[PDB]
Amino acid sequence: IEDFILHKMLGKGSFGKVFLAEFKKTNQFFAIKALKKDVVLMDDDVECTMVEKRVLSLAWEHPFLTHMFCTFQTKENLFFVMEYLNGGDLMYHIQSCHKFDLSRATFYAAEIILGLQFLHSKGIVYRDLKLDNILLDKDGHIKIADFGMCKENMLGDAKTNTFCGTPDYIAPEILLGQKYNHSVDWWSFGVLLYEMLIGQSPFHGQDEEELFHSIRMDNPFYPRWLEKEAKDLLVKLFVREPEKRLGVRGDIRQHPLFREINWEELERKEIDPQNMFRNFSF
């Protein structure tokens, strides 16, 4: 770790803090996630750390997921050395820009879709899709980050039941206590897309209880200036019954909103914008 200069703290993710780090001998910068073994054991999230390592290794395969170069440990901390994406997170951009025009939001939404579908095809349910977790690379393309909450081996008819996720993005099926699958990511995606276009969250509440009631009963507000095909996509995403939700049912890529997108070219980026943790190193 002394081989790196920790210039600044980028933020705190699932677990551990993330720093902008320079590898002294090369001037190359990276984003390092640091975790204190001791609170990792107390919070008994040893496997949660293995999950992230695993998904980050998998992500190497996809252009819209954050990549990891290596992993190493000290006698008190765990470190994930990931690629540095200088564009910042989308939440930040939405806060300063208030909202994105339909074309820009559509472009990010499409790349997010491919990132999610890749994860799902690999038996993974992300469970933490939110603006805060979407970063922009220096080329203008996005990358999903923070995989500490993923659930693997979600293949075939496999379903899971842990209540989790950021409240604003929690799917209704989870709130109603049903065993669930990738359908929850498609709901969070809808919330995320709604936010990029409207600059506000679709479901409100003075507190979490009110928010949950809103997620379960209310219909989001759609401004008169919101394009019809965008409203239609959101409406199909905000279907309570998970088995009737676009993304779970049908082909979200064929929705009119994405009519001008060549998905294959998009993915090719041809469309411009005591011994608990042994062998952990990599």
Side-chain angles (χ1 to χ4, degrees), residues 179-199:
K179 276 179 256 80
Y180 62 85
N181 60 25
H182 73 291
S183 71
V184 303
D185 291 332
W186 291 114
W187 175 276
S188 301
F189 173 73
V191 180
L192 191 162
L193 173 53
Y194 180 104
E195 296 180 316
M196 287 198 287
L197 292 164
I198 306 300

Side-chain angles (χ1 to χ4, degrees), residues 33-92:
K33 182 170 189 161
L35 301 160
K36 310 162 221 185
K37 295 179 179 176
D38 171 24
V39 325
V40 166
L41 284 165
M42 300 285 281
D43 293 329
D44 59 284
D45 301 332
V46 187
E47 170 65 7
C48 291
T49 71
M50 297 306 284
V51 174
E52 178 154 43
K53 177 183 168 184
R54 230 134 52 204
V55 181
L56 284 171
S57 294
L58 174 70
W60 187 266
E61 204 179 317
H62 202 83
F64 307 135
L65 296 184
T66 304
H67 305 336
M68 166 181 74
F69 291 106
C70 76
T71 215
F72 72 88
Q73 74 194 304
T74 266
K75 197 163 295 183
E76 312 163 10
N77 296 73
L78 292 179
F79 297 104
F80 297 70
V81 178
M82 300 164 274
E83 66 184 313
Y84 161 54
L85 309 164
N86 67 33
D89 63 278
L90 287 197
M91 178 58 93
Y92 175 73

Side-chain angles (χ1 to χ4, degrees), residues 84-139:
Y84 161 54
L85 309 164
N86 67 33
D89 63 278
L90 287 197
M91 178 58 93
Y92 175 73
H93 294 300
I94 280 300
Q95 294 190 310
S96 64
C97 296
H98 293 197
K99 59 190 160 194
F100 296 150
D101 170 73
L102 179 58
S103 294
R104 180 182 289 282
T106 294
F107 182 80
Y108 296 153
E111 300 190 330
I112 287 173
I113 282 171
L114 292 176
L116 279 188
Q117 291 183 329
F118 172 74
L119 289 177
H120 294 173
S121 75
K122 292 294 176 170
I124 298 165
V125 175
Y126 186 54
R127 298 198 294 192
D128 199 37
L129 185 60
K130 58 186 184 186
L131 288 178
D132 310 60
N133 290 339
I134 302 297
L135 299 163
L136 278 172
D137 201 337
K138 63 180 188 297
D139 49 9

Side-chain angles (χ1 to χ4, degrees), residues 9 11-18 33-36:
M9 185 195 190
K12 49 187 178 183
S14 255
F15 32 61
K17 308 294 188 176
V18 180
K33 182 170 189 161
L35 301 160
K36 310 162 221 185

